[PDB]
Amino acid sequence: ALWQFRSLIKCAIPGSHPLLDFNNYGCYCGLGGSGTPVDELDRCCETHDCCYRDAKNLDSCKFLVDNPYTESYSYSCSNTEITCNSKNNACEAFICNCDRNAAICFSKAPYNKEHKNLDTKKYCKGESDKC
Ligand SMILES: [Ca+2]
Numbered sequence: 001a002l003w004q005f006r007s008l009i010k011c012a013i014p015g016s017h018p019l020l021d022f023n024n025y026g027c028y029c030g031l032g033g034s035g036t037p038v039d040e041l042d043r044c045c046e047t048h049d050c051c052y053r054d055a056k057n058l059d060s061c062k063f064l065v066d067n068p069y070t071e072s073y074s075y076s077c078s079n080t081e082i083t084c085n086s087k088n089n090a091c092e093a094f095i096c097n098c099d100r101n102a103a104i105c106f107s108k109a110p111y112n113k114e115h116k117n118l119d120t121k122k123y124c125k126g127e128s129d130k131c
Contacts, residue, residue, distance in 0.1 A: 001069060001070065001072040001073070002070075004072060004073065004075065004096075004099065005018075005069070005099045005102070006019065007077070008075065008077070008082050008099050008100060008102075008103040009022065009102075009103045009106060011077035011080055011082050011103065012082060012104055012106065012107040013080075013106060013107045014080065022041075022045070024116070024117055025042070025045070025115060025116050025118070026038045026039065026041065026042030026118055027042055027046075027118065027123065027124035028042050028043075028045035028046040028048075029044075029045035030045075033045065033046060033049050033124075034120065034124045034125070034126070034127055034128075035120070035123065035124030035125055035126050035127070035128065036124075036126065036128050037128065038123070039110070039112055039115055040109040040110060041105075041110065041111060041112070041115070042115065043105075043130075044102055044109055045102070046128060046131065047101070047102070047105065047131055048099070048102035048105075050130070050131035051094075051097075051098035051101070051102070051131075052068050052095075052098060054094075055068050055091070055094050055095050055098060056068070058090065058091055059090070060089060060090035060091035060094075061090075061091035061094065061095075064091060065091055065095075068095045068098070071092060071095055072092075073085075073088050073093070073095055073096040074087050074088050074096070075100070080107075082103060084096035084097055084100055
């Protein structure tokens with residue numbers, strides 16, 4: 001679920017404010033996405049977008065979960081380490097992992113303030129054929 005993704009990000013990145021820091025960043029961090037990712041961090045979001053695209057096509061997710069942000073999963077956080085609990089079913093596990101990988105990627109990528117609140121209509125034209 002969305003509140004869990006925010007929580008995973010805070011686990012991986014102590015002191016972060018997910019909605020302020022990552023939502024609406026670059027071409028892919030936020031609802032939707034297009035163009036070529038402007039940087040490593042943006043590529044993390046493109047990858048997460050793709051992961052959610054894949055999740056929607058998973059058998060265990062197909063009709064039960066149309067929007068992964070409404071699907072809660074089981075996880076734990078310890079010393080900035082994220083764990084997707086085994087109790088998760090196929091659909092819940094896939095989503096948790098998408099979020100977990102995204103959170104880690106975010107924590108290891110440089111943060112470019114000038115890529116925040118990007119004018120996507122001017123800098124995100126076209127479509128990246130990735131993932
Ligand atoms: Ca996106």
